[PDB]
Amino acid sequence: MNIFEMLRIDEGLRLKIYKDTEGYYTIGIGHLLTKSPSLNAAKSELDKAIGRNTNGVITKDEAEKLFNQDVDAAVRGILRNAKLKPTYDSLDAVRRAALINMVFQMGETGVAGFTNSLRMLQQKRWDEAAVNLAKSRWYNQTPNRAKRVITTFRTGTWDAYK
Ligand SMILES: [Cl-]
């Protein structure tokens, strides 16, 4: 198991424009297109992202390419962020994948807002961090995916994904 397989399980794969759990226009492996309610603004972003006239449909390779970019952007955003970087550097490899997962889903800003939980992860107080992470909108809205991520932080193994 690795970050790519983990995120592919959590996000799934759709080759046609769809709406996410928040109701936003998305495509591929969790690639957010726009928060705008316009399906046209969505198609326009999509064509911009792919570099061709897509009419809302992409191929598997195209989905995979967006996915490579998104993962790369996520890690990098973590490494340039004063609140995230110290937590990331402190963790083992499996738990690093859990943090990349949260950032891919909610963005750097959202994650940087879990101040108390990050402080608990740095200290390696696993059980305590798991309880604090669950007191969030994130956990209440996407509880099955949140439990998987939280279990990963708690255990430092890929058990929740096997
Ligand atoms: Cl893009």
Does 104 appear as a known binding residue?
Answer: yes
Q: How far is the CA of 54 from the centre of ligand 1 (A)?
A: 14
CA 145 – CA 131 distance, rounded (Å): 15
Resolution (A): 1.7
CATH class of 1-162: mainly alpha
Residue positions annotated with a catalytic role: 11, 20
Q: How was this structure determined?
A: X-ray
What are the residue ranges spanned by the domains of the chain? 1-162
To which H or E segment does residue 70 belong?
A: helix 60-80
Question: What single letter denotes the amino acid at residue 100?
Answer: I
Cα-based distances in Å from 124 to 47, 64, 99, 135: 44, 34, 14, 19
Work out whether strand 25-28 and strand 31-34 pair parallel, antiparallel, or are unpaired.
antiparallel
